[PDB]
């Protein structure tokens, strides 16, 4: 009885029940709120099948309390292994499906607006000069500002991961043509006059701006005063007229037409140019091989109580860090997407609560390796730990889209 610990001089496992409660309370309060509020645009733009596998893990994690401090019977050493081996498998296998998507879907976004510059601008897959005289390759990516021949060569060799002898491929300016494009956004937004304009359009004629300040640099497209304001109003019928009569259309009008088209219609009409039952599919493969660690290791080494309201069990060090070690993988590949979609703005800037997720996360779960095996208390400090995690992952995540459904339903609109 925690309750008769707490008595006796021992608060840790009426602290651990507590946190835990408050936790399924939360957790069953953020479930509920997306299943009334499902069809508002802040739950309906992102994955709500996924979500409810992440809750459910959330879930599951405060429930491994009531199997850690819990009366001797050998199921619950078996629901100890389920819980915290699966209960991370079951979050994070739904959040790394999330994640990858958005890194495939920011991934062909990119590829539109390079299929536009190569139409627009040009493009050479062996290396030349620019006017100044550096070296360069693709559409103008420069690669070094020294004289020599083989030290662009060496820079493009460590840009690619090959040995290319000066030539590439169009995948491979691509590559490059994204650090171009990551290098002119960030000016954009550092400049004062271009960075309100940029904020304002949609995806499709963000790519036209980026065009623009490839061809006239951006205090060049700082020019453009008024039909930038016309834009920025989306004005779309008279900012292209406007733009029609300035020297950049008269001096390169064939290119200038395609760009103030893409204007108008913000689609790519002016130019030549992932499932949702397969997220469920996925997530749920990714927790079945958990799955299979664990029942794997119930064979290997079958649960048993060692031997008191602390549930000691037989769980050997292979039979912790074997889900350990997935459910860090699980983790990484996390961060990883999530950390290179850490700027997508889609879904009210879900992403940019995501990534912050997952840095806690790699904080919390890389401090409770020394922290676990160095101490003599690991019961209790496996229950905060899983409980901690949890509150992260439904902290960061979840209570930022539960505050505007609750608090700001003005806000919550497409
Ligand atoms: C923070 O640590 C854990 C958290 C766990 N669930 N978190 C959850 C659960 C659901 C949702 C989000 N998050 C499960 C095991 C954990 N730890 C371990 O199994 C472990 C064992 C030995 C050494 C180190 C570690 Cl890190
Ligand atoms: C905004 C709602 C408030 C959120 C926190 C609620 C706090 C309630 C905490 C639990 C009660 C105190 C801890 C339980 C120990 C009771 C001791 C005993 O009964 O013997
Ligand atoms: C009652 C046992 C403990 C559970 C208490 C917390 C209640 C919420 C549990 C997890 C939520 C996961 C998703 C639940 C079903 C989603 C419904 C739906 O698909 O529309
Ligand atoms: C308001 C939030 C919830 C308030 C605190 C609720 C917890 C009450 C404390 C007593 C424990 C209740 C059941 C836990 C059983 C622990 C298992 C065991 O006794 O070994
Ligand atoms: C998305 C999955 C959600 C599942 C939540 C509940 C998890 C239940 C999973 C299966 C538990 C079965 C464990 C094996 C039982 C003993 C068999 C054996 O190893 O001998
Ligand atoms: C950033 C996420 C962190 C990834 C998960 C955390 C660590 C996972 C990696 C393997 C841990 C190494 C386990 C070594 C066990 C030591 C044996 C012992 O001390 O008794």
Redesign the pocket.
Known sequence: SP?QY??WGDPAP?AAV?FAC?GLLATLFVTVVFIIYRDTPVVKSSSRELCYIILAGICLGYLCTFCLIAKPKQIYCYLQRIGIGLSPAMSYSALVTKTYRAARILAMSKKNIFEMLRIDEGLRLKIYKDTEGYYTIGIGHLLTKSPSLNAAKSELDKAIGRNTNGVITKDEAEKLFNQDVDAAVRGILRNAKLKPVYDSLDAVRRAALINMVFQMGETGVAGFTNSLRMLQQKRWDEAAVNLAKSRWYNQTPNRAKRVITTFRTGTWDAYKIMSACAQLVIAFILICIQLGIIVALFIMEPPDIMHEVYLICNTTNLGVVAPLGYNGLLILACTFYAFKTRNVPANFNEAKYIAFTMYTTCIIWLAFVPIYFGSNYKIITMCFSVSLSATVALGCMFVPKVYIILAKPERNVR
Do not use: A, H, S
């Open positions: 309750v707490l008595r009426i507590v408050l």
